Design a binder for this molecule. Structure first.
Ligand SMILES: CN1C(=O)[C@@](c2ccncc2)(c2cccc(-c3cc(F)ccc3F)c2)N=C1N
Length: 369
């Protein structure tokens, strides 16, 4: 039952959310980043300065070598490992054990994070973007094929001298109605690689950015629990920042802040949330000319570091709806029906004049790549 999966996620602000897993026999306990933006189950499997524990294949009686290496250079860094399979469970998840592919990371650069408290990544996206190629079955595919767990999972990410601690829930194989209020609205998964969606309109304090919607999805828009910020294509970013600056003009900030590098501080409970506007993303609906909107507050896009960082930033690889977006909502990754549902989260942070919202329908191609 889903009650035992509630609060099964933990994290530090800006360093992702992780779920506890065990790998091998006897079971080796590891904290694993829940990542909808990649498709490899990849776990530290050798000593590293930021790892205080790692996967030791030699200690597992059930480990099987696939006799194949994997090398994954990526923009910000890289990881490299060796492929194999082993038994995998999620203690506070479905009561099942599955044989899954595991990339045992032997070498990496700027991949692991100092103090994050996770030792690997659970890529929940689709085979198309798996490394080295799409023949390496992702964890969730193996889980569904090997067990009777329904082809669906949902994420409630709650957020918040030491980085603030965050919590949330990953409900595997269904939807926990206690985790949200109001209605669930669904946007189609445009293609099964990333969790790609289409944004058809963007509003800052009710004011339409009035861009050709192709810009919003140039060259794609994805939902990514493995990204902290709301990331926007350059032209949309600039337009968004312009509008946000204007709405909050009363107070004045350094452009280092708007560039998401500098933090700004008020002291304990004086933060002027009301001076910052709400942001609405309209997502394509299940019905052609129909859309719905998710609206987030400054409490979501200014993330605590008294002090905050502007968690909206520029992207050259399309829109990324990261934690900043997801923390307002209960997000259903309905793989079986090729759609992503959004509803107001029971845990989303807000005040007594505003609240995050999911609302539809609104009547309204925008697909780019
Ligand atoms: C964009 N993106 C990545 O770059 C990657 C990844 C996955 C697999 N292969 C290459 C890159 C990743 C790797 C490591 C850490 C983090 C990370 C996650 C957080 F939530 C916060 C801070 C972090 F640094 C993210 N996952 C995703 N979605």
């Amino acid at each position: 039952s889903f009650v035992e999966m509630v609060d099964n996620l933990r994290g530090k602000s800006g360093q992702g959310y992780y779920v506890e897993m065990t790998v091998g026999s006897p079971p080796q306990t590891l904290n694993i980043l829940v990542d909808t933006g990649s498709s490899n189950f990849a776990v530290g499997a050798a000593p590293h300065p930021f790892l205080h524990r790692y996967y030791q294949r030699q200690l597992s009686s059930t480990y099987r070598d696939l006799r194949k290496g994997v090398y994954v250079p990526y923009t910000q860094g890289k990881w490299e490992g060796e492929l194999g399979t082993d038994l995998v469970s999620i203690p506070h998840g479905p009561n099942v054990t599955v044989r899954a592919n595991i990339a045992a990371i032997t070498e990496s650069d700027k991949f692991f994070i100092n103090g994050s408290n996770w030792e690997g990544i659970l890529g929940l996206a689709y085979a198309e973007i798996a490394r080295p190629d799409d023949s390496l079955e992702p964890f969730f595919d193996s889980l569904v094929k090997q067990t009777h767990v329904p082809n669906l999972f949902s994420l409630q990410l709650c957020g918040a001298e030491v980085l603030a601690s965050v919590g949330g829930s990953m409900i595997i194989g269904g939807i926990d109605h206690s985790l949200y209020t109001g209605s669930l609205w669904y946007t189609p998964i445009r293609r099964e690689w990333y969790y790609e969606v289409i944004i058809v309109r963007v509003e800052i304090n009710g004011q339409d950015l009035k861009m050709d919607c192709k810009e919003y999805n140039y060259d794609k828009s994805i939902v990514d629990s493995g990204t902290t910020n709301l990331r926007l294509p350059k032209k949309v970013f600039e337009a968004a920042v312009k509008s946000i600056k204007a709405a909050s003009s009363t107070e004045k900030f350094p452009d280092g802040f708007w560039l998401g590098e500098q933090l700004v501080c008020w002291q304990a409970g004086t933060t002027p949330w009301n001076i910052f506007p709400v942001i609405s993303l309209y997502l394509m609906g299940e019905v052609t000319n129909q859309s719905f909107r998710i609206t987030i507050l400054p409490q979501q896009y200014l993330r605590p570091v008294d002090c905050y960082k502007f968690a909206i930033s520029q992207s050259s690889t399309g829109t990324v709806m990261g934690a900043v977006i997801m923390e307002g909502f209960y997000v259903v990754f309905d793989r079986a029906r090729k759609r992503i549902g959004f509803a107001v989260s029971a845990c989303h942070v807000h005040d007594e004049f505003r609240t995050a919202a999911v609302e539809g329908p609104f009547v309204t191609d925008c697909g780019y790549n």
